[PDB]
């Protein structure tokens, strides 16, 4: 019988079936590795990244310099993890997930930022934002085809908008 009848039958990120982990405060479901951070399979009750972000947000304009200067404390760590997950939640991001096909000065892809952020290889937010922006830099450097160029432009705008919304950065 369905262990979690009030929870999704497909992942929130890739929108696919399989072995799903179910949140205990909202009806979302995530693959073991599609969630960020990777699901702590033995934590009860387990809350997903959207509920933890809600908890932080309602109980916590800024300048981009100051945001980037922040050390990766658990709040900032969880915000960056959520921003990268929001990037994963778009289909176009699948183009930048695996290690690419060509040679740039420093290649970078989504899964490697997932790995480094998982192992807490970033001491400040600027490291994560800098690897994410380095993906788009290298894409604008090596690919000229119109379809994939537009694709990387769109994914870039998605990352930057989610970046300024989550860390509450000021316009103007």
């Amino acid at each position: 019988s369905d262990p979690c009848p009030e929870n999704s039958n497909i992942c929130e990120v890739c929108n696919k079936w399989g072995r799903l982990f179910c949140c205990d405060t909202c009806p979302r479901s995530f693959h073991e590795h599609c969630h960020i951070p990777s699901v702590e399979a033995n934590k009860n009750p387990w809350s997903c990244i959207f509920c933890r972000i809600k908890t932080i947000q309602e109980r916590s304009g800024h300048q981009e310099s100051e945001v980037l200067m922040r050390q990766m404390q658990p709040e900032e760590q969880l915000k960056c993890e959520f921003l990268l997950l929001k990037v994963y939640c778009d289909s176009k991001s699948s183009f930048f997930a695996s290690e690419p096909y060509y040679g740039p000065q420093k290649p970078m892809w989504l899964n490697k930022v997932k790995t480094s952020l998982n192992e807490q290889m970033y001491t400040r937010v600027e490291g994560f934002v800098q690897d994410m922006r380095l993906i788009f830099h290298n894409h604008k450097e090596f690919y000229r085809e119109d379809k994939f160029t537009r694709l990387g432009i769109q994914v870039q705008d998605i990352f930057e908008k989610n970046f300024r919304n989550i860390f509450a950065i000021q316009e103007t």
């Binding site: 979690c4 039958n9 079936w17 799903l20 399979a41």
Partner: peptide
């Protein structure tokens, strides 16, 4: 954390 098993034809 609770788990379940879903499938496209299920």
């Amino acid at each position: 954390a609770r788990t379940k098993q879903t499938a496209r034809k299920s």
